[PDB]
Curated annotation (Swiss-Prot):
Induction notes from the record: Up-regulated by IFN.
The record's note on its domains: The coiled-coil is necessary for the cytoplasmic localization.
Gene Ontology biological process terms from the UniProt entry: negative regulation of innate immune response; negative regulation of NF-kappaB transcription factor activity; negative regulation of protein deubiquitination; positive regulation of autophagy; positive regulation of cell cycle; positive regulation of protein binding; protein autoubiquitination; protein destabilization
Cell cycle among keywords: yes
Annotated protein name in UniProt: E3 ubiquitin-protein ligase TRIM21
Record field: transmembrane: none
Amino acid sequence: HHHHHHMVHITLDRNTANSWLIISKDRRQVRMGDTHQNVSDNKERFSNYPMVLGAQRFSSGKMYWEVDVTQKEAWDLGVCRDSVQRKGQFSLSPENGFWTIWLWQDSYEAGTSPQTTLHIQVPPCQIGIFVDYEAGVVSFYNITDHGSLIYTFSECVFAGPLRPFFNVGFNYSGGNAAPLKLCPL
Ligand SMILES: COc1ccc2sc(N)nc2c1
């Protein structure tokens, strides 16, 4: 891909984070804490899952960013509508305002309804996310494997401003403590 030149500087929005997340001072890394992080609750925070949004809102143009997933067993990445549900149980699907992929139990899947099996030969340590708002496209790239395509959502019906979307995953196993990191340009 030649999407690198639409690079955007993403930062995490603390106010949207699940109350167990620890976001770095620079707002570029997030990990699961082993306890509640001593913040007040609010209607914006994701309650059920270890999710957080980027601060940036996109309503036009082409945007690209990269995320480091090194040594994680579970995570979700992509974009979502600014108005997605925050509280209670929900599935990650376009119908609910999400355009995501994930790793779970040694398989990679795209968040379609129902979910789509991904075919990844080289387990990624860094993922590139490309959004073309006008074209209705969200694409995922394997930066570890020379930028190879992972998945394209096309004919997307965004129906609102978009925000970068992250899930660090639970750490029941003790093998998923590592952070998600936004990679430098
Ligand atoms: C790549 O794995 C990492 C990186 C940073 C940290 S801080 C912590 N408690 N666990 C980890 C694991």
